[PDB]
Write a protein that binds this ligand. Structure first.
Ligand SMILES: O=c1ccn([C@@H]2O[C@H](COP(=O)(O)OP(=O)(O)O[C@H]3O[C@H](CO)[C@@H](O)[C@H](O)[C@H]3O)[C@@H](O)[C@H]2O)c(=O)[nH]1
Ligand SMILES: O=c1ccn([C@@H]2O[C@H](COP(=O)(O)OP(=O)(O)O[C@H]3O[C@H](CO)[C@@H](O)[C@H](O)[C@H]3O)[C@@H](O)[C@H]2O)c(=O)[nH]1
Ligand SMILES: [Mn+2]
Ligand SMILES: [Mn+2]
Lengths: 258, 258
């Protein structure tokens, strides 16, 4: 309850919008857990203040600062900035168990049952199913694990340049061990898989609990008509329209309070 | 040994080429099991004779004939012809356990360790990871199971129009039960995933044991230069070139014997 949380991340104002929508969707579906978001100094004061209303806790991380434990590793592998910031999710020892969620995800139903899972639990990644998608995962905050993850980042880096490669390398038993650590795909439904593998989507898509907007084009990169309540041209904009309805209804007016 | 086999299928001469390459690759990697192939009357006599040399057993199936157990179901769902023919793989009760392999797959290493698996074992499908790919699976021949599969085909059909939808509907516990029934992706490596998710491929692709040529364009739809030993323009034609080397070296000359 108080010791468990959903954790997201935002390094800029664009992803902050995503974080704000994600946070609102979690409250909308009455989560009994806390909401935390990792932010960087590059996030504007207005976005930061909005996040302070939506989330129960707003933590500030600055790996660009020499005082940060990940900085040394950043100098060695500068292309891993976002990934190194994301790893600080393991530094939140005020929580016994958390569910990390990318700022570009959207909750469509209560997913508190994820807290029954153990580290490391995640849904399979489309494209290479033997790797889990790092957009949504169940983990347990720990300084030891964090240090172990930093060590691997320093020595090996990430085979994909992001957090997915690093996490899959460290939590390498995922593909062959414990089916319970394989989160059902509907807990991290790739938006690409939706408009593509149409048959499978038509069959199981209605059970979606979380949508992950993976492409280059994020939800905030579209134009939304408030009158027709739909984005402008995608055979399935329904999810983009939900994202935008929350943004229009709860997020935008909240940003006007400042 | 004698009671276990690899089983493929070919309804025409084009896929027969694939079946012939697949069969040769299995012998090349010294399989200790038998090789069986399901064929239809539409397969030419020359292709049939070549298959009789490569495979230990060539079974003929004709669902277009009123005497076939699947015919009645075919009349009801005519678009399922290939799928209904494929299901006859369960009718091979002369074998205690088999590994079904699509004619468009290619074995790059001995995979006899698959016979340690139980029905139903299969690799995850890219696109929708909670569904297994029906191109490669471990099953146990049985008239009862066959009748149960026909029954489902008749009543529900297939959500994807092919065998994957039907098999996933029947063997629906796959995604949430027994990690051992999840064959490693390298036992059914989608050719699409190779040229696409490049990072993951560069990291684990060298361990590939089976390649599955999924697209519209099958290996036999390419032009191969015998002098340079490579197909004509694909950042990774290496697999197409292996397929063609076997076809050029073992299959083509074999077809000349007739
Ligand atoms: O400038 C940035 C970029 C990313 N993020 C955060 O990092 C997360 C991950 O990155 P994102 O921008 O969402 O990338 P994706 O399109 O979701 O994908 C990448 O990350 C996925 C899971 O993390 C992998 O499946 C992909 O292969 C990888 O390309 C985002 O949701 C944000 O929370 C920021 O805060 N600021
Ligand atoms: O005219 C035909 C068509 C198919 N086959 C056989 O059926 C198998 C399956 O079909 P294939 O032509 O290989 O289709 P795929 O491109 O491999 O894909 C289909 O089948 C896959 C697994 O069976 C699924 O992952 C895909 O979603 C589905 O589109 C083939 O390998 C052959 O053994 C024939 O003998 N004759
Ligand atoms: Mn993401
Ligand atoms: Mn196939």
């Amino acid at each position: 309850m108080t010791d468990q949380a959903f954790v997201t991340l935002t390094t800029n104002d664009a992803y902050a919008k995503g974080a704000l929508v994600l946070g609102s969707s979690l409250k909308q579906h009455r989560t009994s857990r806390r909401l935390a978001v990792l932010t960087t100094p590059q996030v504007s004061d207005t976005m930061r203040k909005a996040l302070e209303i939506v989330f129960d806790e707003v933590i500030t991380v600055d790996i660009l600062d020499s005082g940060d434990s990940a900085h040394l590793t950043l100098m060695k592998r500068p292309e891993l900035g976002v990934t190194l910031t994301k790893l600080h999710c393991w530094s939140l020892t005020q929580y016994s168990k958390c569910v990390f969620m990318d700022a570009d995800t959207l909750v469509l139903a209560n997913i508190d049952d994820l807290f029954e899972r153990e580290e490391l639990s995640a849904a399979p990644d489309p494209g290479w199913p033997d790797c889990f998608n790092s957009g949504v995962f169940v983990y347990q905050p720990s300084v030891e694990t964090y240090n172990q993850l930093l060590h691997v980042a320093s020595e090996q880096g990430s085979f994909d340049g992001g957090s997915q490669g690093l996490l899959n390398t460290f939590f390498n038993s995922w593909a062959t061990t414990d089916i319970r650590k394989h989160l059902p795909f509907i807990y991290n439904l790739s938006s690409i898989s939706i408009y593509s593998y149409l048959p499978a989507f038509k069959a199981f898509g209605a059970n979606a609990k979380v949508v992950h907007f993976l492409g280059q084009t994020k939800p905030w990169n579209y134009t939304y008509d408030t009158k027709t309540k739909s984005v402008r041209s995608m055979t399935h904009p329904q999810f983009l329209n939900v994202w935008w309805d929350i943004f229009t209804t709860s997020v935008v007016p909240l940003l006007q309070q400042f």
